[PDB]
Write an enzyme that holds these catalytic residues in place. Structure first.
Site, PDB file in Angstrom:
ATOM      1  N   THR D   1       0.761  -1.167   0.002  1.00 20.68           N
ATOM      2  CA  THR D   1      -0.163  -0.033  -0.083  1.00 20.68           C
ATOM      3  C   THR D   1       0.843   1.282  -0.022  1.00 20.68           C
ATOM      4  O   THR D   1       1.694   1.504   0.930  1.00 20.68           O
ATOM      5  CB  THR D   1      -1.207   0.027   1.057  1.00 20.68           C
ATOM      6  OG1 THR D   1      -1.760  -1.140   1.230  1.00 20.68           O
ATOM      7  CG2 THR D   1      -2.067   1.137   1.202  1.00 20.68           C
ATOM      8  N   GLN D   2       0.661   2.054  -1.073  1.00 25.09           N
ATOM      9  CA  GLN D   2       1.647   3.045  -1.194  1.00 25.09           C
ATOM     10  C   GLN D   2       0.657   4.374  -1.216  1.00 25.09           C
ATOM     11  O   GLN D   2      -0.624   4.491  -1.285  1.00 25.09           O
ATOM     12  CB  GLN D   2       2.180   3.100  -2.451  1.00 25.09           C
ATOM     13  CG  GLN D   2       3.312   2.114  -2.675  1.00 25.09           C
ATOM     14  CD  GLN D   2       4.301   2.658  -3.729  1.00 25.09           C
ATOM     15  OE1 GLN D   2       4.461   3.745  -4.352  1.00 25.09           O
ATOM     16  NE2 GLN D   2       5.373   1.539  -4.001  1.00 25.09           N
ATOM     17  N   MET D 107       0.141  -6.448  -3.500  1.00 25.07           N
ATOM     18  CA  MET D 107      -0.315  -5.191  -2.813  1.00 25.07           C
ATOM     19  C   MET D 107       0.710  -4.175  -2.657  1.00 25.07           C
ATOM     20  O   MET D 107       0.638  -3.244  -1.275  1.00 25.07           O
ATOM     21  CB  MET D 107      -1.057  -5.361  -1.653  1.00 25.07           C
ATOM     22  CG  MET D 107      -2.233  -6.524  -1.892  1.00 25.07           C
ATOM     23  SD  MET D 107      -3.450  -5.903  -2.627  1.00 25.07           S
ATOM     24  CE  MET D 107      -4.239  -4.603  -1.551  1.00 25.07           C
TER      25      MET D 107
ATOM     26  N   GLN G   1      -6.526   4.288   0.342  1.00 27.87           N
ATOM     27  CA  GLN G   1      -5.931   3.007   0.216  1.00 27.87           C
ATOM     28  C   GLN G   1      -5.888   2.503  -1.109  1.00 27.87           C
ATOM     29  O   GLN G   1      -6.753   2.709  -1.659  1.00 27.87           O
ATOM     30  CB  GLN G   1      -6.811   1.966   1.316  1.00 27.87           C
ATOM     31  CG  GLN G   1      -5.823   0.903   1.921  1.00 27.87           C
ATOM     32  CD  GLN G   1      -5.897  -0.498   1.372  1.00 27.87           C
ATOM     33  OE1 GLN G   1      -6.658  -1.274   1.377  1.00 27.87           O
ATOM     34  NE2 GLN G   1      -4.785  -0.715   0.677  1.00 27.87           N
TER      35      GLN G   1
END
Ligand SMILES: *[C@@](C)(CO)[C@](*)(O)[C@H](CC(C)C)NC(=O)[C@H](Cc1ccccc1)NC(=O)[C@H](CC(C)C)NC(=O)[C@H](CCc1ccccc1)NC(=O)CN1CCOCC1
Ligand SMILES: *[C@@](C)(CO)[C@](*)(O)[C@H](CC(C)C)NC(=O)[C@H](Cc1ccccc1)NC(=O)[C@H](CC(C)C)NC(=O)[C@H](CCc1ccccc1)NC(=O)CN1CCOCC1
Ligand SMILES: *[C@@](C)(CO)[C@](*)(O)[C@H](CC(C)C)NC(=O)[C@H](Cc1ccccc1)NC(=O)[C@H](CC(C)C)NC(=O)[C@H](CCc1ccccc1)NC(=O)CN1CCOCC1
Ligand SMILES: [Cl-]
Ligand SMILES: [Cl-]
Ligand SMILES: [Mg+2]
Ligand SMILES: [Mg+2]
Ligand SMILES: [Mg+2]
Lengths: 215, 222, 204, 233, 196, 195, 222, 196, 195
Positions: D1-2, D107, G1
Site C-alpha cells: 500500500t502506497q 499489494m 488505500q
C-alpha cells in the site's frame, strides 16, 4: 451468496435427496439450470448450499479421497469417515471465509442409510432429516407434517419434490427446476429434472393446493 | 451530459447532447436538455435531471411575472441572479449545473451556473461529464469574431466530441440560436448521427403465443 | 434496507397504432418472502392509466393521492384529466417531496381524447419526466425489460400484435428477476374500449 | 500500500503512417506545489522504443533503472544485440506489464501509468498502455491522466480508426500532439509549459526533441471579461 | 488562488490571478477575482467561488443602501460589513477576502479578512493558496510610499512567483488601481510575466 | 418474534397470538394477550417494538370507538384497515415511527363475509386468506399453502391452526409459551380457552 | 488505500449449436466514463478448438487466459500431444480460479467448443471457480439485458403453441449458425443502445469441426 | 525545519536552522541538522529526527566501508545510498534529506531526496516546512557561480525569512562550507539575522 | 446458550446437557449429545462456538485414550482437568483460540471420591460441588445454593437437577429441547434414558 432449497431425509427405503436449481447474483437470476447435487461417486451424494465453488471444489476433492481410501483398504468408505474428511478439511480453513452448508448422503452395510450435515464453521451432525438454504423453513413445514419412516419410495420421492415446490413458490431465491435422487445400498438413482413452472400447475390441479393462486 | 455555449457576432448559441442515464443504463435516448426561461433566454442543463428542469421552470415562471410587472423584456442577468441565489440557499443539494444564455435590451450574454451558486462569464463555456472533451475542441478551434454559421459549427463539434468520447453523453445534438433583433430559433435534433441500423430479424410473434388465464372488459366510462 | 427493492415489482408500457398498452406483475414480498400474488400496480383515473413500482406503502399512498387530486380536478374543470396534464401533476407532486421522496417508479399511459394520440411517460422518484415514443420500463427488473423491449419492439403495432410483444417482454424479464413475477396483468387501451388480460406464468 | 508523493501528469501519443509520436511535460509536482521543473519523463530504450511514464517519480526512476539494466542484460552473450536480437518495443512492454501486474498482486504497486511507443523490426507501429493495476490496452491514440479526457478527443479527430493511419502524415500528427499539449497547459492545474516530444519513424528512426514550449496561446480575450455576472467595470 | 493588495503614495492597487479549479481541472482560466463593492472600494476574493460571490453581492447591496442614506462609506466600514458576514457565518463559509479602498481623507487602505472572520488593517496584504510561496519575497521587497510604477512591478513580480510555484494559481494577472484620478484596470499576460 | 397468525375461512376469521413477553434473558410473563377489540365485529392483533405496540393498538381502539359513538354505526373491516394503514403510513416518515405490525380480522355484516388484513409497520396493506408477521410466515405458509381450502369450517380452521403452532414449537429457536386464539364471526368475538 | 481491482466493462455471449458453437464479445474497453480502446479483443483462440473469454477486470482476465493457454501447452508435453477436451479444460480452469479463492480473479469466464461427441458446448464460470455447461450464456455489464432475450428466442421460454390454451409448449430445436449470428448481432445492438459500456465493435468466434472462424461487425460508437 | 544547500564558484554551502519540535514545544533550540557522512560529503536533515539520524548513521557506515575498499566515493554515490534507503523503506520513513558534497573533479554538487525516495540533482535546493515561504525569494535571488560571501548572504537572508514566517523553524542559523580548502563551520545568532 | 450443568453429590457426579442444535432461525437437531467419554471414569461435557466444541472434545479424548494405552493406567480426574486447562490456556493466546467451555465430571478410584471441574475457554479452572456455563448459572445457582447438601444421594441429586431444568424451561427465552443426563460413579459412566 446463494439462495437455495436442499433437503435429504432417511426412510425405510434409503435416502431421498431433492434440490432446486436457481442461482442469483443479488436480484439478478444468473441461472435456472444449476446442478446442486454433486455426484461424489456412484454411492455418495452431496448438496450445494452457500458457496457454489466451495461446494463443487471440495466435494469433488472428497470423491478423490474416497477413491484413494477404497484402493488402500479394499473396502467401501463409510459415510461417517467420508463426512469427517470433509469437515476436518473445512475446519482447517475456518476463519478464511469458506461458505458451505451440505448434506453428505450414503447407504452402507454397517451404517445403513446415513446423512451428515457438514458446515463451513466446522459443524458435523448426524441426523434423519436435514434442510438447508434460503427456503429451508418452507420445506421443513411440508416435511415435518408428512414425514413417516414407513414411507414408500414413490411417496417419499413425491414428498421431497413437493417440499422443494413449497419453497420455490414462497422463497424468491429458490426455483427453476427440481432435481430428485434416491440413494440405495447399491448406489444412487437419478429421478429426473422437473421444471417448477409446469410442476406447479400440475400439482395445483391434481392436489387441490395453492387456492390462493389463480390458474 | 455534455452542454456548451458559444458567443458570436450578433448573438449567442447553446447546444447539448440528448442522453439521459440511470446508472450505466440509458433511460432516454432523445431527451431535451435545452430549456426556455423566456422567449429569448434559454438554458442548457446538466446534473440531476429533475433539479435542472424544476429550477429552470421556477425561475422562468418568476421571470414571466417580473416581465409583466415591469412592462419590460426580461434580462439574462435577472435569470442569472435569481438562479444563483436559489442554488446557493440550498448549499449544492439541488444538483443543477446550467449554461444560461440569451439576448435582451442590454445585448447578448453567456453565463454558467454551478450547483453551489457560483457563476462565471465567458465567450465559450462547457459543463457536464463531457465538458473536458468539449472544452478541448473549443480551446482548439475558438476565435474572436465568429459568425452565426461558424458558431453553430463549433458548438455542435464540441457536443460531438462529448457524444463520441464520453460514455455519459450520446445520441443527438440539440441547438438553440439567440440572435439580436431576431426570434430565437430552437433546432431540435439539429444532428442525428446515431441512427439505429436495421435489425437482422423481425420478432413479431404468431398470435396466441402468450398463455392467458382470464380476459375482461375494463370500464373507463362513467 | 433499500426501499425500492424491498417489495419488488415491475411495470412496462408501450405504444402501438392508435393504441397503448401497460402491464405489471402481481407480486408483493418482504425481501425473500412472497406475501401476495394479487398486488396490482396499475390504477386508472378516468381514461388515464398509472402504473407504480417501488415501495408498496408509497404505491398505495400515491394512488390514493392521485385519486384525490383527479377527482377535484374533474369537479372544477368539469372534464376528465388528459395524460399530458396528468404527467405534469405527477411530476409536481413528486418534486414537492424532493428532500424526503416517495420511493417509486411511476409510469403514465393513455390516449388523448381530443387528438387521439397515444401517450406514455415515465418518472424517477423525484419527478423527472421521461417521455417516449416507443416504451417505458420501471421496477427491479428494469434492466431486463430494457433488453426485451429494445429488441422485440417495432413501431405501429396493431392492438392484438402489441399485446403479444408487451406480454413477452414482461414475462421473460420477470423470470430473470427474483423479486418479480407471481402473476401478471396487461391492459390494452384503444380510443373507446379497454381490455384487461391476466397472463399465465411460472409461480416461482 | 502506497501513496504517490512527487508526481508527473499526462503522457500523450498517437500512430501515423510510418511510425509513432509520444510527448510529456517536464514537471515533477509535489501535491499543489510545482516543485521540480527539469524532469524528463520520456525514456528511450535503444533506437526504436520510447517509454513515457506518469505518476510517482520515485517509481519512475526505478523503472528507468530496470530498462537500463535490461539493455545491459540483453547484450550479454549476444553478438546480434545491435541487429536481429536487439530489444523490440513488444519485448520491453511485456516485461513492464509483467512487473506491474506482479507488484499489484503483492499489494505493493508501482504507482505509474506507462505508454510504450515504438516501431517493430518488420516496420509495424507499436503503441500500448499499462498501469499500476497491470491493465493493458492498445489504440491508435493513447493518453494518461487528463490527457485521456482532453487529448484523446482531439487526436481521435485525426485518427478515429485503423484505416485513418496510412492517411495521416508525420507533419499532421505532430501538429495535433503539440496542439493537445497546449490544451493541457490551459486546463490541467498540474501541468507545465515546457515539454519533451519523441518521434519513432520506420525510415528516419528515433528523433528526440527536448526543451519545447507551448506557444501561439490565446489570452487576449481575457481583458474583455469583467466580474462574474452583473459587474460592468 | 493568489491575491494581494498594496497601498502606495497615490492610493492602493489590487492584484490577482485568473485561475478557478475543480480538483486539478481548471474550470475557468480567465476569472475576475477583483470585484467592486463600491465606486472606489474593491475586494480580492479567495476560497469558495460560491461563498465569496454571495458575500460580495450582499456587501455591495449593504453599501448601496448605506450610500443612499448616509453618503459615501469608508473603507473601514466596508471591511466591517464583510467581517460581520464572515464571522457570524464562519461555520458555513470558506472565504479569504482582502478589502481595499481609496478615501480622500484616509487615502489608500487595506484590510484583510481570513477564514475565522477577524479583521487586520495592513500596509499590504497577500492571501490565497499561492501566497505561501511569496511571504519571504514580499516582506523583503515591500516599501511604504512607493510610486504607481514601482507598486505595479512589485505586484507583478510577486504574483509571477506565486503562479510559478502554485498549481492552483495561473492564467493572467489582473490588477485594479485605486487613486483620486479614478479607477484603472490592468492586465498582464503569460508571455510577459513568466520570463521575469 | 412475537408470533401472530391469521386465517380466514368460510364464515369466520381466526387470530392466534403468542403469550410470551421476554426482556433480556428472562420471560417476564407467559399469559399476555396481544390483541385489542376495535369494534364488536373487528379484532386487531399486534407485534413489534416494546411499548409502541400497546400504545398504537389502544390509540387505534380509542379512535374507532369514538367513531362508533359519533355515528351510532360500526365501521366495516375494510374501512378500519384503511384507517390503520394511513396512520402507519404517516408514522413511517415521522421523527420516531411506530415499529408495529398488525393483523386485522373482521366480519363484514353488510357483505356477510369474513375478512383478514395484513399491515406491516411501513403501512403495507394486503387482504389475504391467511397471514402472518415476522419469522412466523417462514414456517407456516408452506403448510397453509398446502392444506388450506377456501370453503373450510371454523373447526377445520382451528385444526389447520394447531398444525401451524406444532410446526413452530418444533422448529423455532425461542419458547413463545403457546398462543391465545380468538374467533371473529357474525356473532362477534370470542376466545378459545383450551388450546 | 490501494484498490487492486478495477472494472474494464464490456460484455460477452456464448451460444451452443448442434455441430457448432459461438463466443461473441464487444471490443470496447473502458474505465469509469472514458474509452480506453474501441478495438481491444477479449475472445481468444486457445488451441484444441477451444475459445475463451474472461470478462470484468481486464488485468485478471488477461492473466487467466494467458495461464490457460499455458496449461494447454503443458498438457500436450506431459500427455503425448493429446487433445484437451472441452470438459477437461473446464475442470482445469476451475482449479486455476479456485487457486486464488482468497484473492480472486475478478472475471466472468466463458469457454466454447465441441464436446467429444462433436456437439456444441459452452461452459461458464463464476470468479472463484464454480462452473456449469449451458446452451446459452451472457456475461459482463449487459448480461442482464441480453440473457432474458436469449431465454425467449433460443430456449423458447414463455412461448406456447398457438390455439393450445397454453397447454402445449413451443418445441425446442437446434438453430442454424446463420440464425444464431442474427440473434447475437441483435442482442449486442440492443445492449449498445441501452448500456453505455457497450459499443464500438462486435467480434464473433465460430467453432466447427473444420476449425475456428472469425466475424467482425461495427457497433455504435457513442 | 528549514534547510538548504547551495553550489557556488569554489564549492558548496549547507545551511539550516536549529529548532526541534514536539507539537508546539521546542524540544531542542540548538539542534545540529547538518551532519557528516564523509569528510567532504554532508547532508541536511528534515522530517523525523529519529528516522533521519538512523538513515545518516547507516549511510556513514556504508561510505566508510566503501572508502576502505574502493577509495573516496562521489557525491552522486552518497546520494544513491541515501535514496536506496529512503525509497525501499518509504512506507516506514518520514525523511526529507539534501545531500551536498565537494569533489575536485565534479566540484560542488547538490542532490535533494524528498519523501518518496526520488533523487534530483540541482544547482541549489531548499527543504523543510519553512522552505515553502522562500521559494519566491530563492528563485529570484539565486545566481550560478556566486562567491563565498555572496552565497553566505543568500543562505542567511533566505533562512532568515523562513524562520520569520515558520513557527517550526528558529534558533540559530548553522552553515557548513565545503571547498578544496577544507571544511568550515559557521553560526549566526538571532540578534544578527532577525533584523536583516 | 447451550445449557451444560453439573452436580457433585456424595458418591457420584451428574452432568446435564441440552439437546438442541440451532443454526439461524431453525432448530436443526433436538437429540444432540454434547459430551465425550475421556476415560471409563471421566466424562466431559462442552459448549461454545460451533465446530470448535466437537473438534476440541475429540482432540482431548484422543490424547487421554493415548495416555491410557501407553501406561495401561487411567489418569485421575484432577490430572485430566489440569491437562485440559493447559490446552485451553495455550489456545487463548493462539492465532485462532478454541472458544469452548467445559465441565469435567469424574470419579477418582484411588480416593473413592467424585469430582467436578469447571473450565472456561480462557483456561480458568475451579473444583466445585455444582457448576454451570453460560447463562445457565444465572438461574440455577440460587436453587443449588439453597437445596444443595453435600451428603445427598444420586436420586436426591437427580431430583435437584429436575428442579433446575424446570426453572430454565420456565424463565429462559430459548427452547433448548430438554437435556441428556449422565451419571459418573465407581461403576463408570451411564445414561439416564427417561428424563
Ligand atoms: C449526462 C447524461 C450525465 O451526466 C447529463 O448530466 C444528464 C443531465 C440531463 C438528463 C438533465 N444527467 C442525467 O441523466 C442524470 C445523471 C445523474 C444520475 C444520478 C444523480 C445525478 C445525476 N440522471 C438522472 O438524474 C436520472 C434521470 C432519470 C433517468 C429520469 N435520475 C436518476 O438517476 C435518479 C437520481 C435521482 C436523484 C435523487 C436524489 C439525488 C440525486 C438524484 N435515480 C434513480 O431513479 C435510481 N433509483 C431507481 C429506483 O428508484 C429509486 C432510485
Ligand atoms: C485558489 C484556487 C485557491 O485559493 C482561489 O482561492 C479560487 C478562488 C476564486 C475562484 C474566487 N478558488 C477556487 O477556484 C475554488 C477552490 C476551492 C474548492 C473547494 C473549496 C474551496 C475552494 N474552486 C471552487 O470553488 C469551485 C468553482 C466551481 C468549479 C465553479 N467549486 C468547487 O470545486 C466545488 C466546491 C464545493 C464546495 C466544497 C467545499 C466548500 C464550498 C464548496 N466542488 C466540487 O464541485 C467538487 N468536485 C467534484 C468533482 O470532483 C472533485 C470535487
Ligand atoms: C522541522 C521541525 C519540520 O520539518 C524539521 O524537519 C525537524 C527535523 C530535525 C529535528 C532533524 N523535525 C522535527 O523536529 C520533528 C517534527 C516531526 C514530528 C513528527 C513527525 C515528523 C516530524 N520532530 C521530531 O521528530 C520529534 C523529536 C523529538 C521530540 C526528540 N519527535 C516527535 O515529535 C515524536 C515523533 C513520533 C513520530 C511520529 C510520526 C513519525 C515518526 C515519529 N512525536 C511525539 O513524541 C508525539 N507527541 C507526544 C506529545 O504530544 C504531541 C505529540
Ligand atoms: Cl469567481
Ligand atoms: Cl536531530
Ligand atoms: Mg421463488
Ligand atoms: Mg459517448
Ligand atoms: Mg520561528
Amino acid at each position: 451468496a446463494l439462495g437455495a432449497t436442499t433437503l435429504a431425509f432417511r426412510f425405510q427405503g434409503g435416502i431421498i435427496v431433492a434440490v432446486d436449481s436457481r442461482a442469483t447474483a443479488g436480484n439478478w437470476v444468473a441461472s435456472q439450470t444449476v446442478k446442486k447435487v454433486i455426484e461424489i461417486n456412484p454411492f455418495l451424494l452431496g448438496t450445494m448450499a452457500g458457496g457454489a465453488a466451495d461446494c463443487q471444489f471440495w466435494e469433488t476433492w472428497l470423491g478423490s479421497q474416497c477413491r484413494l481410501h477404497e484402493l488402500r483398504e479394499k473396502e467401501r468408505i463409510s459415510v461417517a469417515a467420508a463426512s469427517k474428511i470433509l469437515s476436518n478439511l473445512v475446519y482447517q480453513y475456518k476463519g478464511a471465509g469458506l461458505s458451505m452448508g451440505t448434506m453428505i448422503c450414503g447407504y452402507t452395510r454397517k451404517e445403513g442409510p446415513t446423512i451428515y450435515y457438514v458446515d463451513s464453521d466446522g459443524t458435523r451432525l448426524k441426523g434423519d432429516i436435514f434442510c438447508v438454504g434460503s427456503g429451508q423453513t418452507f420445506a421443513y413445514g411440508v416435511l415435518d407434517s408428512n414425514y413417516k419412516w414407513d414411507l414408500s419410495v414413490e411417496d417419499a420421492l413425491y414428498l421431497g419434490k413437493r417440499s422443494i415446490l413449497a419453497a420455490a413458490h414462497r422463497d424468491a431465491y429458490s426455483g427453476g427446476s427440481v432435481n430428485l435422487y434416491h440413494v440405495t445400498e447399491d448406489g444412487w438413482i437419478y429421478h429426473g429434472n422437473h421444471d417448477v413452472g409446469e410442476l406447479f400447475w400440475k400439482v395445483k390441479e391434481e392436489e387441490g393446493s395453492f387456492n390462493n393462486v389463480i390458474g | 451530459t455534455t452542454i456548451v455555449g458559444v458567443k458570436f457576432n450578433n448573438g449567442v448559441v447553446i447546444a447539448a447532447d440528448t442522453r439521459s442515464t440511470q446508472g450505466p443504463i440509458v433511460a432516454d435516448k432523445n431527451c431535451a436538455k435545452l430549456h426556455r426561461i423566456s422567449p429569448k433566454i434559454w438554458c442548457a442543463g446538466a446534473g440531476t435531471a429533475a433539479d435542472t428542469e424544476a429550477v429552470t421552470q421556477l425561475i422562468g415562471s418568476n421571470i414571466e411575472l417580473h416581465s409583466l410587472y415591469t412592462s419590460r423584456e426580461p434580462r439574462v442577468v435577472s435569470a442569472l441572479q435569481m438562479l444563483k441565489q436559489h442554488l446557493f440557499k440550498y448549499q449544492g443539494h439541488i444538483g443543477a449545473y446550467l449554461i444560461v444564455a440569451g439576448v435582451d435590451p442590454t445585448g447578448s450574454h453567456l453565463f454558467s451556473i454551478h450547483a453551489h451558486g457560483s457563476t462565471d462569464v465567458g465567450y465559450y463555456l462547457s459543463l457536464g461529464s463531457g465538458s473536458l472533451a468539449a472544452m478541448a475542441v473549443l480551446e482548439s478551434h475558438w476565435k474572436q469574431d465568429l459568425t452565426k454559421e461558424e458558431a453553430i459549427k463549433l458548438a455542435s463539434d464540441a457536443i460531438q466530441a462529448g457524444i463520441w468520447n464520453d460514455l455519459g453523453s450520446g445520441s443527438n445534438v440539440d441547438v438553440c440560436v439567440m440572435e439580436i433583433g431576431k426570434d430565437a430559433e430552437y433546432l431540435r435534433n439539429y444532428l442525428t448521427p446515431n441512427v439505429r441500423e436495421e435489425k437482422q430479424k423481425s420478432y413479431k410473434f404468431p398470435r396466441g403465443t402468450t398463455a392467458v388465464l382470464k380476459e375482461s372488459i375494463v370500464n373507463i366510462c362513467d | 434496507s433499500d426501499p425500492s427493492s424491498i417489495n419488488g415489482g415491475i411495470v412496462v408500457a408501450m405504444t402501438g397504432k392508435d393504441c397503448v398498452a401497460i402491464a405489471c406483475d402481481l407480486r408483493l414480498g418482504s425481501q425473500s418472502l412472497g406475501v401476495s400474488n394479487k398486488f396490482e400496480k396499475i390504477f386508472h383515473y378516468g381514461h388515464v392509466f398509472l402504473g407504480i413500482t417501488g415501495l408498496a406503502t408509497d404505491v398505495t399512498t400515491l394512488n390514493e393521492m392521485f385519486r384525490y387530486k383527479t377527482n377535484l380536478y374533474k369537479l372544477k374543470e368539469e372534464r376528465a384529466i388528459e395524460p399530458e396534464t396528468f404527467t405534469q401533476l405527477v411530476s409536481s407532486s413528486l418534486y414537492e417531496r424532493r428532500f424526503g421522496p416517495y420511493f417509486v417508479g411511476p409510469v403514465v399511459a393513455g390516449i388523448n381524447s381530443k387528438s387521439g394520440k397515444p401517450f406514455i411517460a415515465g418518472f424517477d422518484l423525484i419527478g423527472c419526466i421521461d417521455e417516449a415514443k416507443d416504451f417505458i420500463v420501471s421496477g427491479t427488473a428494469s434492466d431486463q425489460l430494457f433488453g426485451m423491449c429494445e429488441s422485440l419492439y417495432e413501431p405501429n403495432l396493431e392492438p392484438e400484435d402489441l399485446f403479444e410483444t408487451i406480454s413477452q417482454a414482461l414475462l421473460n424479464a420477470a423470470d430473470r428477476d427474483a423479486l418479480s413475477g407471481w402473476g401478471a396483468v396487461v391492459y390494452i387501451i384503444k380510443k373507446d374500449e379497454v381490455v384487461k388480460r391476466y397472463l399465465k406464468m411460472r409461480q416461482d | 500500500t502506497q501513496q504517490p508523493i512527487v508526481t508527473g501528469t499526462s503522457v500523450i501519443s498517437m500512430k501515423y503512417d510510418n511510425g509513432v509520436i509520444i510527448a510529456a511535460d517536464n514537471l515533477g509536482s509535489y501535491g499543489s506545489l510545482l516543485r521540480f521543473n527539469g524532469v524528463e519523463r520520456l525514456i528511450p530504450v535503444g533506437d526504436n522504443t520510447v517509454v513515457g511514464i506518469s505518476g510517482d517519480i520515485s517509481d519512475m526512476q526505478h523503472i528507468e533503472r530496470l530498462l537500463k539494466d535490461l539493455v545491459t542484460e540483453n547484450a550479454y552473450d549476444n553478438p546480434l544485440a545491435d541487429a536481429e536480437e536487439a530489444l523490440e518495443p513488444s519485448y520491453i512492454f511485456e516485461y513492464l506489464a509483467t512487473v506491474m501486474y506482479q507488484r499489484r498482486s503483492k499489494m505493493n504497486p508501482l504507482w505509474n501509468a506507462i505508454i510504450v511507443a515504438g516501431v517493430q523490426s518488420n516496420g509495424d507501429q507499436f503503441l500500448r498502455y499499462v498501469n499500476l493495476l497491470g491493465v493493458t490496452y492498445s489504440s491508435p491514440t493513447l493518453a494518461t491522466g487528463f490527457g485521456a479526457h482532453m487529448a484523446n478527443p482531439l487526436l481521435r479527430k485525426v485518427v478515429d480508426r485503423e484505416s485513418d493511419i496510412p492517411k495521416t502524415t508525420v507533419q499532421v500528427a505532430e501538429e495535433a500532439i503539440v496542439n493537445a499539449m497546449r490544451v493541457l497547459y490551459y486546463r490541467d492545474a498540474r501541468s507545465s509549459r515546457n515539454f519533451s516530444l519523441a518521434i519513432i519513424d520506420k525510415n528516419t528512426g528515433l528523433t528526440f526533441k527536448k526543451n519545447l514550449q507551448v506557444e501561439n496561446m490565446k489570452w487576449d480575450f481575457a481583458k474583455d471579461i469583467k466580474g462574474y455576472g452583473t459587474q460592468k467595470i | 488562488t493568489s491575491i494581494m493588495a498594496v497601498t502606495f503614495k497615490d492610493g492602493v492597487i489590487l492584484g490577482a490571478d485568473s485561475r478557478t479549479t475543480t480538483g486539478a481541472y481548471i474550470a475557468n482560466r480567465v476569472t475576475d477575482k477583483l470585484t467592486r463593492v463600491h465606486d472606489k472600494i474593491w475586494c480580492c476574493r479567495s476560497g469558495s467561488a460560491a461563498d465569496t460571490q454571495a458575500i460580495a453581492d450582499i456587501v455591495q447591496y449593504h453599501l448601496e443602501l448605506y450610500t443612499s442614506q448616509y453618503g459615501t462609506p469608508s473603507t473601514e466600514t466596508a471591511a466591517s460589513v464583510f467581517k460581520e458576514l464572515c464571522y457570524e457565518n464562519k461555520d458555513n463559509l470558506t472565504a479569504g477576502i482582502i478589502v481595499a479602498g481609496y478615501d480622500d481623507k484616509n487615502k489608500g487602505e487595506v484590510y484583510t479578512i481570513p477564514l475565522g472572520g477577524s479583521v487586520h488593517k495592513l500596509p499590504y496584504a497577500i492571501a490565497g493558496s499561492g501566497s505561501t510561496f511569496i511571504y519571504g519575497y514580499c516582506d523583503k521587497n515591500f516599501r511604504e510610499n512607493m510610486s504607481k510604477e514601482e507598486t505595479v512591478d512589485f505586484i507583478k513580480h510577486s504574483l509571477s512567483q506565486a503562479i510559478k510555484w502554485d498549481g492552483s494559481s495561473g492564467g493572467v494577472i489582473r490588477m485594479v488601481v485605486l487613486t483620486a484620478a479614478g479607477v484603472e484596470r490592468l492586465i498582464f499576460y503569460p508571455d510577459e510575466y513568466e520570463q521575469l | 418474534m412475537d408470533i401472530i397468525l391469521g386465517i380466514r375461512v368460510q364464515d369466520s376469521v381466526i387470530l392466534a397470538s403468542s403469550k410470551a413477553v421476554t426482556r433480556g434473558i428472562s420471560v417476564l410473563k407467559d399469559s399476555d394477550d396481544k390483541t385489542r377489540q376495535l369494534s364488536p365485529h373487528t379484532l386487531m392483533s399486534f407485534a413489534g417494538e416494546a411499548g409502541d405496540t400497546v400504545q398504537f393498538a389502544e390509540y387505534i381502539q380509542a379512535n374507532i370507538q369514538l367513531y362508533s359513538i359519533r355515528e351510532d354505526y360500526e365501521l366495516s373491516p375494510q374501512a378500519v384497515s384503511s384507517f390503520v394503514r394511513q396512520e402507519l403510513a404517516k408514522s413511517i416518515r415521522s421523527r420516531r415511527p411506530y415499529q408495529v405490525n398488525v393483523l386485522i380480522g373482521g366480519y363484514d355484516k353488510k357483505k356477510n363475509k369474513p375478512e383478514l388484513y395484513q399491515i406491516d409497520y411501513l403501512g403495507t396493506k394486503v387482504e389475504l386468506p391467511y397471514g402472518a408477521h415476522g419469522y412466523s410466515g417462514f414456517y407456516t405458509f408452506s403448510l397453509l399453502d398446502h392444506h388450506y381450502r377456501p370453503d373450510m369450517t371454523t373447526e377445520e380452521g382451528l385444526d389447520l391452526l394447531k398444525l401451524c403452532v406444532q410446526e413452530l414449537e418444533k422448529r423455532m429457536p425461542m419458547d413463545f409459551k403457546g398462543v391465545i386464539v380468538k374467533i371473529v364471526d357474525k356473532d362477534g368475538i370470542r376466545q378459545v380457552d383450551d388450546f | 488505500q490501494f484498490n487492486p481491482y478495477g472494472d474494464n466493462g464490456g460484455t460477452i455471449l456464448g451460444i451452443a449449436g448442434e455441430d457448432f458453437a459461438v463466443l461473441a464479445g464487444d471490443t470496447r474497453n473502458i474505465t469509469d466514463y472514458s474509452i480506453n480502446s474501441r478495438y481491444e479483443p477479449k475472445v481468444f483462440d486457445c488451441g484444441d478448438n477451444i475459445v475463451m473469454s474472461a470478462n470484468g477486470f481486464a488485468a485478471d482476465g488477461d492473466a487467466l487466459v494467458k495461464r490457460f493457454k499455458n496449461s494447454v501447452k503443458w498438457y500436450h508435453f506431459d500427455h503425448n500431444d493429446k487433445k484437451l477436451s472441452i470438459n477437461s479444460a473446464a475442470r482445469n480452469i476451475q482449479h486455476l480460479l479456485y487457486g486464488k479463492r482468497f484473492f480472486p480473479y475478478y472475471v466472468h469466464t466463458i469457454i466454447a467448443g465441441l464436446d467429444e461427441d462433436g456437439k456444441g458446448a459452452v461452459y461458464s464460470f463464476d470468479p472463484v471457480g464454480s462452473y456449469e455447461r449451458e446452451q446459452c450464456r451472457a456475461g459482463g455489464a449487459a448480461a442482464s439485458l441480453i440473457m432474458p432475450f436469449l431465454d425467449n428466442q433460443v430456449n423458447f421460454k414463455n412461448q406456447y403453441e398457438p390455439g393450445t390454451n397454453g397447454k402445449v409448449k413451443k418445441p425446442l430445436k437446434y438453430l442454424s449458425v446463420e440464425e444464431v449470428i442474427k440473434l447475437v448481432r441483435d442482442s449486442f445492438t440492443s445492449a449498445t443502445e441501452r448500456h453505455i459500456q457497450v459499443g464500438d465493435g462486435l467480434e464473433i468466434l465460430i467453432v466447427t469441426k473444420d476449425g475456428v472462424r472469425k466475424e467482425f461487425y461495427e457497433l455504435k460508437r457513442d
